[PDB]
């Protein structure tokens, strides 16, 4: 039995790796194992529990901020020992954290092949993001197999000296993850009957406009009394103090505290539309086929704005009210959005990663690139 | 100067190639070079830097015992970051492909200090061979602000890894500068007869069994040139001495010495009309000094030298060696052409180019022009 160790330390990483773990379990001759490398073991176990996954080993790390050189030095030796003791035949890492490179380097120094999930993304500037851009580039120098989420990612890797045979375009495992989480998660309790409209103004950008936006949300809720608007506020002093004094009295509105990945996925899934200012929650909406209205007017990947998935409602208070209201009064246009083709993946990226690993371990054939 | 440039290295070979850079930096207004030793033999490296008149400014704390790679890197990283920050480094220069070199470069990067990589770009194209050196150099170059490539080929390798043109400078080898410096600072062996001299060196293990025959050929050469003194620092290996001593001891114009130090040997070669050797390393040293070299081999371990006309092959047949060496010593024009041949490794000023490259990055001067082969 070949052992494949997935090493990660944050909840976002855990959710993106869960589909990979699940697909590996379905391959004969392979056994997936999880090595936690972060802080907050309870939070990670909770995140993994949504998918019925428990870790196999945990590294010993400090619970607060540590100087980067000290963090790397603390992870390296531990990681090398953990990977050898776990009997790893292959190691999968994800993302661009310092911890991720340290684990990849430990594996390489121990002669264990490394696969990098969601690899190839580049800014072209080592000073931004710091030290993430360097972390991912360093990690890719050592990778046996790069799992690029897009054709562009593959192009980047090819310009850095990576061989085509060592690159597999898989699409985003995040797509697989949210689709599954939507089914596994449970809606917030106590919520009224639907239809629902999920609202989440997370971005710390619109600090001032936050109030005006809330005023617009109140008026749209009045324009749609037969619709329930669920809004999980970040219980932040600056945020709460700006939205609650405006929405608290709206019987049509439901204010909740931050939700967990599974619950938020289920809520979005059970919603007719998503109103947000977060790029992350916009991509999840795309995978779920849920229409999204971004409270912006530019920036980001026009991939989704390439018609379908999302639409911009600008920052203008009155403009937003009209954009959203116009949509909720146009459901059949919202139907055109839900049927939009997902440009981020087919929900089988996790399976492709697992098959790629099986191929490297001589257990199966090389899968073919995912095509948008 | 106001800006501080830390050169971090931990082995004698690295110190030798970095010395020319250190001295060139000391000559640039607004810059002050500093040395951070990163190896296991402080006193040993300390003495090596002595020849060049360089002292270290700080040393990392490294175990003497062998250690697993992950543990070594972990041991180096934190203290390196702290040392570079406490030394107030505005720029860091590293050399080589060791694990420590990458650990230092990563420490500098994490502290936000630009890093320059000397003699960068050489690749094997295989992460398994050499291990972990190929990985070490590729990792180091991901983080480098300026790569100083010894050759156009090295530059081509760097571009192939995503490095941008503006971030690469072809400098030639600082090793050339080092020999010239060592020759100038060194002193010839004591009590030598009045010159001219011919330096002789034979120690290629494969030539071992031919040493007696080759020594006899050299004895014939010495007898044919009574006015020249042949100086031969003989290696300590008893096998070598049993072969050469009985033949060359007692030869009037042959001087047999014990192995010389880097500087003393460079000085001897510089004072010689010709170098006779079977060593690739010494052949390259002769070329740095513009000293004609005759190689006692049937083929060269590098085509560059032969192509450049800096060396002549004499083969290993005794009669042939005599004919070639005697012929060359009686052909002043051929010897002259060899001394005037363009060195295919560097122009002896690679250190100055590296120094100017750093000054340019720090906004203290224009970008130097690339060395041309």
UniProtKB/TrEMBL annotation, chain A:
Pfam families: Epimerase_2. GO terms for molecular function: UDP-N-acetylglucosamine 2-epimerase activity. The keyword Isomerase applies. Residues 26-351 form the UDP-N-acetylglucosamine 2-epimerase domain. Keywords: Isomerase. Coiled coil: none annotated. InterPro entries: UDP_GlcNAc_Epimerase_2_dom, WecB-like. Its EC number is 5.1.3.14. The keyword Mitochondrion does not apply. It comes from the Bacteria. PANTHER family: UDP-N-ACETYLGLUCOSAMINE 2-EPIMERASE (PTHR43174:SF2). Belongs to the UDP-N-acetylglucosamine 2-epimerase family. This is UDP-N-acetylglucosamine 2-epimerase (non-hydrolyzing). It comes from Thermus thermophilus.
UniProtKB/TrEMBL annotation, chain B:
Its EC number is 5.1.3.14. It is an enzyme of class 5 (isomerase). Residues 27-352 form the UDP-N-acetylglucosamine 2-epimerase domain. GO terms for molecular function: UDP-N-acetylglucosamine 2-epimerase activity. InterPro entries: UDP_GlcNAc_Epimerase_2_dom (IPR003331), WecB-like (IPR029767). The keyword Isomerase applies. Keywords: Isomerase. Pfam families: Epimerase_2. It comes from the Bacteria. PANTHER family: UDP-N-ACETYLGLUCOSAMINE 2-EPIMERASE. Belongs to the UDP-N-acetylglucosamine 2-epimerase family. This is UDP-N-acetylglucosamine 2-epimerase (non-hydrolyzing). It comes from Thermus thermophilus.
